[PDB]
Amino acid sequence: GYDYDYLFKIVLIGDSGVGKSNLLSRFTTDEFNIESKSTIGVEFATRTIEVENKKIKAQIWDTAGQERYRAITSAYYRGAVGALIVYDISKSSSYENCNHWLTELRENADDNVAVGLIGNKSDLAHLRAVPTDEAKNFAMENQMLFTETSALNSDNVDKAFRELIVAIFQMVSKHQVDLSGSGTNNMGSNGAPK
Amino acid sequence: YHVEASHTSRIIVPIKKIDYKKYNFENTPIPRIFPGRQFIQSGLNEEQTIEMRQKF
Fold first, then answer.
1. Which of A22, A25, A106, A176 has the fewest CB atoms within 10 Å of its CB?
2. Residue B37: closest C-alpha in chain A
3. Cβ-Cβ contacts under 8 Å, A89 against chain B
4. In chain A, where the domains are located
5. B40 and A132 in contact by Cβ < 8 A?
6. Which of A54, A108, A121, A116 shows the shortest CA–CA distance to A84?
7. Does the annotation place A65 within a ligand binding site?
8. Which class is A6-172 in CATH?
9. A172 in B contact zone (CB under 8 Å)
10. Residues B39, B43, B49, B52: is their CA dihedral positive or negative?
11. Beta bridge partners of A59
């Protein structure tokens, strides 16, 4: 059937050409349909993990930036609870508006979100557009999870994304107790009197 | 020499040249006092890097 317990939606946001989709498609198992990016805009792949004996579906929505979808993508951040700003260390002008994406995503996403920040394409280690310690600091006074996100031969994502679903899980994993259902008696022949 | 309170005195120091086939002046440029650091892109043209190396 379906049988999962919670379902989160997590946007991937950034400038165009920073390498979000190739980061996605290694990492999620698949989405069963290649489909296309730019017909409705934003595409989406699923990922199922389990936390704390609860089973979680997480739906990653990565967003394109072709300047046509102006009102459309801002409608797509409505209700968005998990977030990931991706930037590349090779090029440098994406970091000038990573803060622009951050203040657009603090706007109209939820009451509270948990935004990660990820540096794609660490494979070309000899081309650092921005120092990692500055982005690490900018994550530190913005309450953001920071990962190297090196491209190829990496798991940085397979521990950081699980940690993102943990932090967003106890943001909404409120409370429950038990569903045991073992209390049985009263098998008589009913000498009733009304 | 003697310089009193404002009087400049241009010292004329004679030296020789240097030989371009004796020193290489295209070696690792502007060496850092301490090794390591961020290792950010230079952000300058290779030709500019040549004249900055010579002028240092």
1. A176
2. A131
3. none
4. 6-172
5. no
6. A116
7. yes
8. alpha beta
9. no
10. negative
11. A9, A46
**Which two structure tokens, joined as six digits, stand for A92?**
């440098």
Question: If we measure between CA atoms, which residue out of A124, A126, A104 comes closest to residue A115?
Answer: A104
Distances (CA, A) of A89 to A17, A129, A166, B44: 12, 5, 27, 17
The bridge status of strand A82-88 relative to strand A54-62 is unpaired
Torsion of CA A96, A97, A99, A103, to 10 degrees: 160
Containing A146, the helix (H) or strand (E) segment is strand A145-147
Helix (H) or strand (E) holding A9: strand A6-13
How far is B12 from chain A, CA to nearest CA, in Å?
47
A19 is in an annotated binding site: yes
The CA distance from A148 to the nearest CA of chain B, in Å, is: 14
Tokens of A23: 């980061």
Q: Which amino acid is at A86?
A: V
> Given phi > 0 = left and psi -120 to 50 = alpha, else beta, which region is A67?
left
Resolution in A: 4.3
Pairwise CA distance, residues A188 & B32, whole Å: 93
Nearest Cα to Cα of residue A19 among A90, A102, A96, A100: A90
| Strand A114-120 relative to strand A145-147, pairing | parallel
Task: Provide the token pair at A97.
Answer: 């508006």
Strands A54-62 and A43-51: antiparallel
| Cβ contact, residue pair B41, A131, below 8 Å | no
